[PDB]
Design a protein around this ligand. Sequence first.
Ligand SMILES: Nc1nc2c(ncn2[C@@H]2O[C@H](COP(=O)(O)OP(=O)(O)OP(=O)(O)O)[C@@H](O)[C@H]2O)c(=O)[nH]1
Ligand SMILES: Nc1nc2c(ncn2[C@@H]2O[C@H](COP(=O)(O)OP(=O)(O)O)[C@@H](O)[C@H]2O)c(=O)[nH]1
Ligand SMILES: [Mg+2]
Lengths: 54, 47, 430, 161, 427
Amino acid sequence: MRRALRARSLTGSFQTDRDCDDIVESLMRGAKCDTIPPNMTQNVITILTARRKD
Amino acid sequence: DEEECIYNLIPKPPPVIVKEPLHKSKFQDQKQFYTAKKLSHATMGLP
Amino acid sequence: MREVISIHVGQAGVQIGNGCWELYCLEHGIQPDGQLPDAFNTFFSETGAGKHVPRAVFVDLEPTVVDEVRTGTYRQLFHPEQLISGKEDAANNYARGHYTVGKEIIDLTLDRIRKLADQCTGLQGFLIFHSFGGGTGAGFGSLLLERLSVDYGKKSKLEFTVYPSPQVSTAIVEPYNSILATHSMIDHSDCAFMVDNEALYDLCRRALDIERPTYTNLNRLIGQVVSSLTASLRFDGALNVDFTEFQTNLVPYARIHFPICSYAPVISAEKAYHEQLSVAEITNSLFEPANMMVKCDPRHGKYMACTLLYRGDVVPKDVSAAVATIKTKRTIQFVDWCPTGFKMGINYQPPTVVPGGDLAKVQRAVCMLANTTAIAEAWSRLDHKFDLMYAKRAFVHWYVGEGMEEAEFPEAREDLALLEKDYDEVAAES
Amino acid sequence: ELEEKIAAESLEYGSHVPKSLPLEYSKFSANALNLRERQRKAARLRMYDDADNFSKQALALEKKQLQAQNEKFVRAFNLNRKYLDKKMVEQRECFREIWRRKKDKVSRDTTAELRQSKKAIENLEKELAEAQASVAKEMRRIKLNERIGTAPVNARPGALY
Amino acid sequence: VREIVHIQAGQCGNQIGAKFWEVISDEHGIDPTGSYHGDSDLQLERINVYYNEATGGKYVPRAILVDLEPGTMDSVRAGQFGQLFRPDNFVFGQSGAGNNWAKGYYTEGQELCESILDVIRKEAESCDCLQGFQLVHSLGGGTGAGLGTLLLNKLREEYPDRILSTYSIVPSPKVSDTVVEPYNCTLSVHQLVESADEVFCIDNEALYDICFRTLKLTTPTYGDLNHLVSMVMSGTTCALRFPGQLNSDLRKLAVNLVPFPRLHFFIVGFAPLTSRGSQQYRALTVPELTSQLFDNKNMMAACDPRRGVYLTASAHFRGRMSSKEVDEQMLNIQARNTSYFVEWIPSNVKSAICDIPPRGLKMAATFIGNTTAFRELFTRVDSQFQKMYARRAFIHWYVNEGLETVEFDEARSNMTDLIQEYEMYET
Ligand SMILES: Nc1nc2c(ncn2[C@@H]2O[C@H](COP(=O)(O)OP(=O)(O)OP(=O)(O)O)[C@@H](O)[C@H]2O)c(=O)[nH]1
Ligand SMILES: Nc1nc2c(ncn2[C@@H]2O[C@H](COP(=O)(O)OP(=O)(O)O)[C@@H](O)[C@H]2O)c(=O)[nH]1
Ligand SMILES: [Mg+2]
């Protein structure tokens, strides 16, 4: 019931998460880090940090 | 009670439990007992 | 022989009980420890070598008020099993005092009262005290009455309850608690008397000349009525009224049982030096709106049958002359059915005083219980206060969180509406 | 209906189980970040062989505290679930309580209405028996009169016509 | 037998609690070495509320001390009543405070929390009954604002029924004692809104103004300020310790005053205040107490009640008085000043009476209020948070500790929603 125990998005929407998951998966296949759009890097960094921890 | 004609359906009218508006008591004059003279602001003055 | 059981619940009930048992013990002549320096046995049980124990049960879900008696002078009087204390109070929450925390102590309470009734060979009724605004007075009070209905069945259950005053209030959730307890009490109670602090405050200032009363002074006033009410079973009298007699005479139906009470004379020492207060005067003082202990004007409605009780050197003829004069009052409205409309009683024992008291040693006094339609004023106030809160759902989360189902809130509202409907239907033209 | 509401409540509580460790539990402590900073600055210098040691020292510390926080999360979830479970038990306790009272209301009113008619029937049945006793006694006297007898007193005539 | 556990966290909380134990020990009559030499049997009735007894007639308080650095602990250790505390109850780290909410909550808080909870568990399980917890901390710092919330969440996890009453100090409106307060306060609010049950807000600026306006203190030190705060904390729990004509404990206060789960922030006040040399001219009576209680200048929080509207209010009275006088005064203040009290709640003012007042005074009163005026305080911090956050600015010192930017957005969202919730119910 507590907000910590309840699920929450890592960004403004799950749709952004899916777009970030797609680009991270592309990075997993050998794409260089400069292919990321400049505005898009922040969400990538947060999710990569979360998924290393996972 | 085995008759086929009974089988089809047993309809019921809208609930006979009263849809009536809630009763309004006649005893509504209350200036006898609500007595303290109301004021907008005396003790806690205006901002 | 004939016996009555007193139950005290919450702060208001037990604090009234302290004053009542002071009045009783001094009246019969028993020292506070229960020894001697008759009608003793209707209120007390006698142990060997001359020690007396009352028939009372003190219950509240918090120990502060009860522990005052346990440390006080009267600690020697009561039986320690009688004094029952909970752990944490209901916090003025009906749902807390009925479902969650009330059920913890209920069966312990029921064993003691039933145990106390075994020694009562001729029990004829119960005396129970409430304050409807409290969580324990209402939530635990409603729970207690529900069991006593099936445990004892056809035994008269009389109540003495503090009703929420029109203007003076000490709890914000007070209107919520009163309506919920209203449903339980209307079905189970044999007859429930109504009192309120606001009228008793004004009475304790005008008639008794007190600048600034407290809860203590009001508690002594209620004890006088209960002592006068039960005096017919205790002392001698020319006309006796047993608990079944008030029951049939006062009420025409089942749901119209609620009376209101009055008492006279309530005078100070230095005023009685002038006012004689013979039978005719004290009978007239009863019917004034000033002396009513519930702030609902009798002139708003009409009167059903009334009962009068006299304490003192009173002769039946003077009673008949006084009642005849009352029927000549055109400011007093009576219902055309019940042309008789009265039952009178006379007893030969004057009232009892208390050291450091507030009342005078009047050698004759009268007590009044009356049935009237004016109490519909009191419920309409309670009805309006509740609707404003429930429209915006002001405090529902507290009650729901403690197990209460929300559907009870409209049902308790609905039941109060029928009660208001019933009184106006009877009050209508014949 | 109460059972349906409870079932909907049970579904709502368990619908949003997080698929990974939540944000607040997800963080490290001081002794991990400090070792990362010294590792990163060591590799900035031409001193790689000491930065690698710091990284391998810090990895075994992150690996501990992450699973240490995992147990706290699971315990907290279980404790929150047990609170909701005792509450819905209390909800059922109120429902059985209220309808116990609602049953008592009918179970008393119906027996009272029957009790009015029961005593009335038993009252007249006793009246009938005592009434028939007088008729039988008079018939017995008249039958015995058939063989020797004496004249009895007569009832009151001329009441009203 | 309604014991209360007291926790002191941070620089501000530790010093306030230190004065708070002097206030009680004088009222109950306990020597600084813990011996009883008092003057009344009534003081021993329910001393179990705050104290444990050590075999030998030595009374030990239920106190737990928390800090990240031992700096303030040593000052209390040398205090006049320092011997009173239990030596094992002192829990501290070995790192600088940092004045950083993220560092206190995440970096050092985790290491300290496991020891602190077991220290609490010793006292919580030691007594016959436990009603609620008592926490003292500030909302502008890094230790109290961060670690206090963390312990509040853990307390709510283990003990989901007890009342989690805390006392907090809010950053001042004009001049404030920390650069990064809007970050710390907004982050702290999100924890406090959900986990707590009662929160009392006190402002330093109003304490200064109260001292100069009424008490005529030319040089008010922090000792006098903590003395003023200590009176209210003594007053609330007084209904547990002494008999009275109408008892009102914590849970009664919570049910009466809180109409919706989230509107539970409170303003506090105390009366009467002994003006140096001038109280000879003043005739202390019950109506005079009411005049000071509802006077806007005596409020300890610099939020003007007159710019908002009231929802619920509560007053306690201590000493032998008439009950009719109290019930009439609450009636008069609500009838004469209608505009500020809402319509859809009749009888907005609760009352209570207790017969035993504090030492020296003949009667004392405590005022606890709830009003929409708190929207002034949250708007004040929100604008500061907004504009600093746009520049990013000090974020560098929170990100490096492991706090992600989404937490700033979430904290503002909940804090703004709280503001609108006070807006909506004004209608
Ligand atoms: N006449 C009279 N009324 C009293 C006295 N003490 C309390 N009351 C009334 O009791 C009412 C409220 O009931 P509570 O005080 O909450 O008592 P309760 O039923 O035990 O409720 P809880 O203590 O919360 O469990 C108030 O409106 C008071 O007017 C008293 O000594 N004399
Ligand atoms: N009333 C009072 N306030 C204090 C005292 N000491 C500090 N404060 C206030 O506490 C606030 C923040 O304290 P802080 O040192 O950051 O506490 P921290 O959370 O432990 O870091 C400041 O705004 C001070 O005004 C004191 O002795 N009395
Ligand atoms: Mg109670």
